[PDB]
Amino acid sequence: KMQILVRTPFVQFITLEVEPSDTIENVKAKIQEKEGIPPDQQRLIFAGKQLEDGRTLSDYNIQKESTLHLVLRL
Amino acid sequence: KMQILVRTPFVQFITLEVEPSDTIENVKAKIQEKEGIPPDQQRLIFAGKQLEDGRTLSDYNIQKESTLHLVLRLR
């Protein structure tokens, strides 16, 4: 009869299957396919560095189960 | 070739279809069905009150599109 919302404290992770040769831009494209956030609204942070679109995951020592941080850019 | 995880700042809401006569116990059961969180691990908080299992949504004047807060209750 009525809709209510329950705000949860749960943290969302985007889980992606990637190759070490994938560029940061390719990862942003995958995030866009999953979430509809354009690449230019995405900052990907790893180990205190904003990752550059043209570099690869392997360049940054990103390994299996590494956690990146997505921060939106308005 | 490998799994990676991208942590996001996005807030998750559980959307429930409920009746004013539903008890808080009924609401917690619905959350369990959707998310596998047992009722004893759920605190539901609204308007500065922890909602009691035996009382109804109507008892709390919870209306359409009210945003309850789920706070996990663990030992």
Judged by helices, strands and strand pairing, the structural class of chain A is alpha+beta
- Element string of chain A (H = helix, E = strand): EHEEE
Report the sheet-strand fraction of chain A: 35-45%
> Which CATH class of the domain at 24-72 in chain A applies here?
Alpha Beta
The gyration radius over C-alpha positions of chain A equals 15 Å
Helix tally of chain A equals 1
So, CATH architecture of the domain at 24-72 in chain A?
Roll
CATH superfamily of the domain at 24-72 in chain A: Phosphatidylinositol 3-kinase Catalytic Subunit, Chain A, domain 1
PDB class: biosynthetic protein
Keywords: Competitive Inhibitor of TYMV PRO, Ubiquitin Variant, UbV3, viral protease, biosynthetic protein
Assembly: dimeric
Entry title: Structure of a dimeric ubiquitin variant (UbV3) that inhibits the protease (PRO) from Turnip Yellow Mosaic Virus (TYMV)
